[PDB]
Amino acid sequence: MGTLEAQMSFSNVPAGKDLPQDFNVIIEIPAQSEPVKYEADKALGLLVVDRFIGTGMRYPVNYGFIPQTLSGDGDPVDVLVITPFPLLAGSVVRARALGMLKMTDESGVDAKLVAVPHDKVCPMTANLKSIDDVPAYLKDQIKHFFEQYKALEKGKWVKVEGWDGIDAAHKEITDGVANFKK
Amino acid sequence: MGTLEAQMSFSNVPAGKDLPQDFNVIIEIPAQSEPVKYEADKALGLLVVDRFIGTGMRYPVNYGFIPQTLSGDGDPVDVLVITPFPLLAGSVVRARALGMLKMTDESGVDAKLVAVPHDKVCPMTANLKSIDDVPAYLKDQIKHFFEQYKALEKGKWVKVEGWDGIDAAHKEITDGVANFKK
Amino acid sequence: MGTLEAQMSFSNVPAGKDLPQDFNVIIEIPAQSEPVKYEADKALGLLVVDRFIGTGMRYPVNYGFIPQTLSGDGDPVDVLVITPFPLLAGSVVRARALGMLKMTDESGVDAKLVAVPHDKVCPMTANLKSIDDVPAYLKDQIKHFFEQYKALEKGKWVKVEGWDGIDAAHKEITDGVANFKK
Amino acid sequence: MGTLEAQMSFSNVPAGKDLPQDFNVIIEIPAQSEPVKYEADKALGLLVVDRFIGTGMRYPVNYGFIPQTLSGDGDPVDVLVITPFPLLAGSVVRARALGMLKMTDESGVDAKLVAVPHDKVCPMTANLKSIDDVPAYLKDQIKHFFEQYKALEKGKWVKVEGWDGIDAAHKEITDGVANFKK
Amino acid sequence: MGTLEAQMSFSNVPAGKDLPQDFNVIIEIPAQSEPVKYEADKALGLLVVDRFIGTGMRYPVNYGFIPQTLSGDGDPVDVLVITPFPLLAGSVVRARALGMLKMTDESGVDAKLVAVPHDKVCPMTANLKSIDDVPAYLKDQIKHFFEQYKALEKGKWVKVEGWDGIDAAHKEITDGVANFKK
Amino acid sequence: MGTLEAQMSFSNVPAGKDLPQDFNVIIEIPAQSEPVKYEADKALGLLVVDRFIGTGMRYPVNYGFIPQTLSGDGDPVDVLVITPFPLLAGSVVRARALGMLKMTDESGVDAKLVAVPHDKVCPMTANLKSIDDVPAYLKDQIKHFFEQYKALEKGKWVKVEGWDGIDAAHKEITDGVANFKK
Numbered sequence A, B, C, D, E, F: 001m002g003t004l005e006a007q008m009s010f011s012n013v014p015a016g017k018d019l020p021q022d023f024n025v026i027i028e029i030p031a032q033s034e035p036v037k038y039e040a041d042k043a044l045g046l047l048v049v050d051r052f053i054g055t056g057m058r059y060p061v062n063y064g065f066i067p068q069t070l071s072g073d074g075d076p077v078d079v080l081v082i083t084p085f086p087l088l089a090g091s092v093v094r095a096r097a098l099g100m101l102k103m104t105d106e107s108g109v110d111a112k113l114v115a116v117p118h119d120k121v122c123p124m125t126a127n128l129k130s131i132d133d134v135p136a137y138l139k140d141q142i143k144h145f146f147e148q149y150k151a152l153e154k155g156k157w158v159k160v161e162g163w164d165g166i167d168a169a170h171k172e173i174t175d176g177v178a179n180f181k182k
Ligand SMILES: N#Cc1cnn(-c2ccc(Cl)cc2)c1N
Pocket: A082, A083, A084, A085, A124, A125, E082, E134, E135, E138
């Protein structure tokens, strides 16, 4: 934001109760929702209609961010949260990391964390200890989704590099948390 | 509100980035949602259950308002926002005007602006330059909806007078913006 | 909350326009929603994913709370709100009491108020004057739901004791309102 | 069908186990379904897309017909079936009559029977003994729906005359059954 | 059916391409559908509205039967089919057995087969080789569902005895197939 | 089907009332339905669960076939039917051609016809006279969908060659109709 011009609901949510391993995710896009991309406006405390997805492709898992984090790209750490039923847009969930999906787009690197709810919240996912426990068919779907959903956004492209584990996820959380407080 | 008694989430959203032509709409009622009327409480920053619609008729397009506007009737400027998928109640969208629907009810005039998302947000609607580009079948549906949805609200009635264009829409935005700051 | 650590959107909603008989309910769980339990975080002003319900059972009526009340268990007064269509999670509704469902769980007593919207809001429910007007099949469903939904939460149990009327509901509202202001 | 040209799944369903009081209804349009009108093709044994409803108005109750009946207008006896959840299009339900809605359109009289499932099938509706037990708000909605849904079908109109009871319903069933066998 | 009275779409579907291990299931009730019980009428070739479930509980997995089988209770072999998205009521699916749920009701034994689609049809479930691979939380849900869904059907009760494996499933298929041809 | 082994509901539906221009389409997959591929079994008269789509991608328009046609690949002529609301799986619709999408897969050519309902059925689409009237964003989505939906079916691939008009569509109908009667 420009000098001249520069002259709550989200930013007051703790990044996590016990970082980096125990963190909070505000949901922006439910799994399987109609192909509209919402992005939290953290100044306004509201979800903003970002884009009607050109390919009409839908998020195969829930999509959100960790409040009070600032990633290298200037946005909060992004998280995919797997659940047995879609989560409400604008809700918050206690989560734990399984790893990450490494990718780069026309603008630089872009990693999305892969997460599940805390075990007490979601017993259905407690079995998932790391990225490699996530079913092959689903990891494939997610990789395909990121490779293709922006196929019809002019000037954009996405390349998926592959997966990473929990340390890598935690470093991302660690650094994002740091950056947000300068 | 009475003298004796008179002794954020919505009202801090800018009316628009470049008024009157580029404005923001907070969504109250998604297109095709079950026949319950919500109204934003701008004091409380929450959607309020206003009415279970007597006829059970549903909004054929998304319905919302422009924050920080005050129309002659004492409420913000109302907007119908056409999209290819319903929008989330309580989300905000960047919009542009196509015109208006002129009508009057038992309480006086009532015009609803007709709008679509900004072109970058919704490429699907970029083709729509003015009210006359909106399909006849849909304009008819909208006119019918406003004529009939309140058919079973005792003491109420609505009469649709016809359509108007972008200047008329902009004047409404212009005046609403002015009124809100006294 | 511990001494050491202790060193808006919900709590600024009035408990009611004319207590105890005319009160407000913020909706946490819509009737018939997928089996995920949300709980309002009144500090954060957001709905939190509380639990994926083990039995996968769904709320047969809308579920919420009255802001600015504090019940003996340390939480706001809980309310079941019957409507002909599910209400939006995080919306507020003007309600009136029909009575209560008395029950106890592993932690102590737990009563849920049973309510409907104000007559002007919902003409469909205006016929319901007291708990005994609520259809037998539905009261049975609600009692069954509370008896069984937590069947697969380890260490938990719920026993339903039976119904009570409007005075009992009002006393609950009365006391909850009092407790919240010390 | 013309002489020259004239040279199972539905027509083999009994009209009823104990006519006229105990009859069967094949569902064509579920309550609250998207505004598309289906009509059973009794020759082909399939539902046919009849019309995208111009007003976009939806059936407030389930809509179907009694197989092996032929009403004066050349079609089977029509039935509105009230249920607590919409019924599957193309399913069959055991029903009992509450009465009828008398109306006429541009083509002549048109009465729709009003029905509910057999008590053992639907205990929720067992309380409804006659047309006058059906809630006022719902009867009003149904009358409004028939008055308005065809508002935007060119050359069509519908006028609702009022209600009738079970004898009238039974006579309709009685005659329809007779006519179908010459 | 009585002597005096006794004087296609389903019954012409093969029980299986390679019995007992490779069999067909016609779906009657999709997983998570609204709490209405459908039952295929094999004489009429249509789904019949059987019951509005008193508890309002929903099937946690898809429910159907194997055509051209006759189980001891006089009905076809029943099957629960697990899939990542609910299946269409009245569709047919190629399936393979994982085992069975043994239970008895007021009328005698009642076993439900547990199945998944053929691997080529559903790669998502190919990992499931036997009943013990099905997640604990889901088996628990299914057992709870059968224990409770009929809680409010007067005169009925269900007791779940426990699980069994593929041989037991196959014997059920084997015998059902035999019985159907006398 | 092999010699040794070779020793209604769909095949008795006319291909069209006035071929090739006025034809019938039986719907197999509704627009926007969950990512499960159904295929009509024309022997059995039922929809069969064909595949859980690996990419989880959904049909952006309705998908079906013209009964009593046999295309070069051994299946009926395939049709994409555009409508303002998804159509019921297993319903039949009166349609007219806009053109075709030419593509080839690992098995040979594969063209899908693009169609809309008859004007009287769907006034919303009457404006569409040819393939070039279909919005660019939608044609792009459809082309992308066919290019990518099978990305995760092992051994499969699809290449889209481009569009064709009504004569080409009609020839396809013409030949398919011929082939079906030897
Ligand atoms: N989210 C989630 C989740 C966790 N376990 N499952 C799961 C696994 C296997 C089967 Cl057969 C069903 C559900 C999920 N869908």
